[PDB]
Amino acid sequence: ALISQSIKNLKGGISQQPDILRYPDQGSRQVNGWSSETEGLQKRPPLVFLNTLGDNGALGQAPYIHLINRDEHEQYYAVFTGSGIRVFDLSGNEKQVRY
Amino acid sequence: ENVQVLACQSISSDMYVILRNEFNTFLARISFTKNAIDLQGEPYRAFMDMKIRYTIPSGTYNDDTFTTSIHIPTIYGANFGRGKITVLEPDGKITVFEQPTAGWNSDPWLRLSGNLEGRMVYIGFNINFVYEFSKFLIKQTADDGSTSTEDIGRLQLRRAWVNYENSGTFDIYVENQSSNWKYTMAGARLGSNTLRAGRLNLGTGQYRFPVVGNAKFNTVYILSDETTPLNIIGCGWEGNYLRR
Amino acid sequence: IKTVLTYQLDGSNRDFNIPFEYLARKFVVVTLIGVDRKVLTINTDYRFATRTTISLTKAWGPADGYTTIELRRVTSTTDRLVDFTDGSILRAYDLNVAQIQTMHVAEEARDLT
Amino acid sequence: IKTVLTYQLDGSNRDFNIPFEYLARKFVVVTLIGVDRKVLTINTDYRFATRTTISLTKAWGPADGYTTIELRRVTSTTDRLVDFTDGSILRAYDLNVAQIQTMHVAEEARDLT
Amino acid sequence: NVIKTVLTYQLDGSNRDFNIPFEYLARKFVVVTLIGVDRKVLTINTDYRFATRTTISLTKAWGPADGYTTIELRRVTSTTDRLVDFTDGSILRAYDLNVAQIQTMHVAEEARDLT
Amino acid sequence: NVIKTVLTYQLDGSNRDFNIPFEYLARKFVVVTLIGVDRKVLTINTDYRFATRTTISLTKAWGPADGYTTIELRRVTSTTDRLVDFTDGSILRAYDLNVAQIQTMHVAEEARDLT
């Protein structure tokens, strides 16, 4: 019957449902993919490098991290080690905390 | 792999995420701007997963062996784990270095070739953008948001095509029950105006690849690694579909 | 100009002129002939005074029986100066050296025959 | 590292490994030695259980004097594994195998000297 | 074993046309010489012409006269001169790429055959 | 009443090929011996060969001479060795399940027939 069809959206996203039950443009899986508005499927943004915070164990094994946005010039992380606090600027520089 | 994402936090326009390797902890930002390049130079806004505008020091090059060697712990904070690092020149040139068995720990030197004495190269890893298209079946959307698939009958699909804009190389894996196929789409093509040497080589086009099978047992998934944007603006397929 | 050549040792003659073109220093190999084949390290045993000339630091003379010094250019087939990746541009400089690197290996074969 | 090498049979051994890298099975040419230069159909007479290891498939034997086997890699210069046609997508793969073929052809010629 | 690049034809009297089996990158690479007294390399302008890509025509009738028993036809590929050069403005095409490897592959042909 | 697994063919002179009607799980299970003087079990490598699945070819032409009057063809199915083994990773298939059922079916044939 020479049937063909084309899809323009692919906004979709991963669906675990059966292929029969999947909406058109869902797709079985996508990794590192960005489904950006009208624009098509894209690679995720590149994650540019900023300063390394420290050693692997410098932060806690399971830390609590809360970004601070006070000013357009001052932004910070308040990352909580299991014991103690560390505070870095978004530039990567570490601002020492005194208790 | 072996990388833990401690916290992703987003300022209005871009998101700053810190993630730990088995040796280090890093800070990095993911910027969601529509077209803007992240770094100065940077011919086409490369996707390198850790981007630095490195300048190679004068002590790196030696003449006894032609290779110019660069030390990863100096360019970054310190040594990494397992990954494929791409070095990208101020122009389009790319050199990719396979992950050694020790994994960049015992061997932290990446050796370019020739005199890259003081170059503005960009050094970064790779991202494996995988997308699996799901099955290709007769799907009609009806009643304002309900799609029904014609389960009755057998579809023998002949081929498929993917439309891309300002996109580089990518591989369209087609995997039937028995065997698998790749169909790498790299360049413009040998007689094309675009393939002109020294030109950035990425452009808009349609790629049609032969996909044959039962339309129900063969999986078509696209993926790419080679540090070049990939924007997929369409997809399609052709089939016979005798109903029985 | 032959890619392979042997020079009369001429006693304590430190330096020797090599006329053939070579893509890289590591490709040029220096051997001593007269008793057995001897391979010399690039940097400790000899030194490249310039690109055109080469000088032996230790002046292995007509002594121990070595009477001639052989200078030949061998281009490694496994080692390639330029390699092509699916991404990236294909600069004309890369395509030219790939052409001449494999030409050098073939030219070495013709001169030996 | 050398493409040309010879294995002595060393008893009825079915398996011999080839150190040199090669592109296609057809390129590797093998001859039995010991009485007269005998060429054999590589595909029918030998089965590649692995890429490096050939199989005599039974104990050819030092008996009868065929106690020597020669391993040679002759990559066909007339038949090019990859030739570029206008209208075909340029790739890293085809450029790489195109280079490694001519570097294999040059290397085989150089070792023949 | 067979020598593809180099082959000799018995003159057997006056024969104008000789066929060249080997492929050649340029007409300057094919060299023709008579054999029997001295290796006399023929000039392309007047001594011998082609009239066909695979055939060469010789003006005079050598045959058994002048002591030249046979004719020698071989191809020598110039190492120093490169047929194809790549420039940034240039568009890559099948012609430029195929010449790059195959010219080198011809040089290795001569070395193997001369051995 | 009929003995399917065990059957003997009169040699009647030089007859090279004999038909094996019973189904057998392996060529090692089918055992062939000449009768008339002693039970001489033939080796599979050289003495006799399976030209086809159902036909055996005996190299020498026996017959009454050699005091071997007849030929005896029977199958013995090995109890200890199992043709099919099941592992967790491996896919179940019709071949695997049929062999398991039919092997112990074969062994019951010999017990019933030898009785």
Next chain:
Amino acid sequence: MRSYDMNVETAAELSAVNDILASIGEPPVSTLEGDANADAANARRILNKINRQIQSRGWTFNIEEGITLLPDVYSNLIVYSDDYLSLMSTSGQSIYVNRGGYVYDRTSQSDRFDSGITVNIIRLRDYDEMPECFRYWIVTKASRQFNNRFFGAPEVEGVLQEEEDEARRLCMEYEMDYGGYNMLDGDAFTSGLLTR
């Protein structure tokens, strides 16, 4: 009749299955053992029954003239296995028929035989061990049924039927070349007449 998987794979059978799968449009399969492909399994089932059928028709190489069937001396009755596609007497009138899997003499009303019989048997062979000219006809016939049974496409169906007719024509052309039948001297009756 045996299971399709029971036949050992060969290069000839691998290409035949690939050709059958190509009819509906499935891609070729690399190896036959250890696959989960349902279509590849069917192609071997269709190939085996077409192979068995085409062999059943009397062919010169297929028919064996005057072969001797030996009975078990103790049992005294010959086994008429399913391997024998046809069992006919050498003379004009055939007197052997199947009764309970054993050769039975209808004119004698006895299935017990002594000293053996001489017959003409068509015996089954693999897909290999078959004349090459017949291999394409087996595939071409098997392609038609495989297309018909699973994915019936009228466009490919018409081409295959034309291809089968040409394939059958060549196979007869093979038999006439193979047979070399002579109507004067090869003929049974005419040979005695030409005696002079």
Next chain:
Amino acid sequence: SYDMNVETAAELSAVNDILASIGEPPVSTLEGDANADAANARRILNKINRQIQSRGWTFNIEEGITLLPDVYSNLIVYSDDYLSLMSTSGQSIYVNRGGYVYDRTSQSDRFDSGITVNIIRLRDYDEMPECFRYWIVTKASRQFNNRFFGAPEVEGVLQEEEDEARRLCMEYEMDYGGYNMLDGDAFTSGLLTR
């Protein structure tokens, strides 16, 4: 410079004609990453090449070549290379049984001193006449679209071309054979002698 005499690889160029028969862009290489159409076209090209040779042509049949058994086993091997095996005169006796030459009349698969037969042996896509090489490609091109991707108008022309291609190869064999009903044939030649 166009003085060059370089020729491209015939096997790939044959595949490209199969791909180009529908308008698909040519493939730069055969070996490498698996490609469905390149794998399909190459297989059909060898499939069709094997078919066309099996039919039998004056150059194809090798007359009176001897097949020698192994000295110890006394068996001849009927390899997959042998496309046909027929006796020289008539009523061909040798067949295949278990991969070995079997003499149906004598009911013995063991021979000594060899046998004389007429064998059609497989050849590459090359080593075939230009008349036949075009026929194989145009036959494989028609088989390509019929099976895998069907274009109605393409098959119509490729059907016409294949008939024309088939006709030309017959004229080749008839010209190659030069068969003579007066002197060439076995029977009438003896009658003509006077």
Next chain:
Amino acid sequence: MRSYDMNVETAAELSAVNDILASIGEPPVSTLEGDANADAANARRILNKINRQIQSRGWTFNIEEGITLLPDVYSNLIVYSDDYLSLMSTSGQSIYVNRGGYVYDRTSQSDRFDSGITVNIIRLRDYDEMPECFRYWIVTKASRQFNNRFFGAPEVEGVLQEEEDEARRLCMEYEMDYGGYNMLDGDAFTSGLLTR
């Protein structure tokens, strides 16, 4: 075979490519060298294939009668290159076949030749170096395939079919005029009969 871009451009080939392009409806191309036109490249590939095929059929000017092929005296074996479209003996029965790219004497089972051989050869020529009457047939056939492969339009397809049939008729008409074959005196057999 050989690459399309290998052949040097000439005015004859430039018009032939333009005519093939027009069959679909593409505008003519000014020059062949240094263009990015994919259709122009295809038209040359289609033209070269049809050029080789139409030459392959035996024509009087194409066929060379009794030309001598000389072997390498050292090698002793003649080269059977792909440029040789057909190789036939001058006598009735042709004895030369191709084995491994070298001329092989099937009756002699030897490919080693001395003193050369006399044969009938069809040798490939360019699109130029061809009779004018044949040039329009090559184009007409090529445009038929070029239209079929890339842009298959039934309306233009039917017109090209009769254009090719007329083109073939004229080419045969050219061949008969070129040949000047005489059935009384030019004939090999009949000439010997006419002696008086």
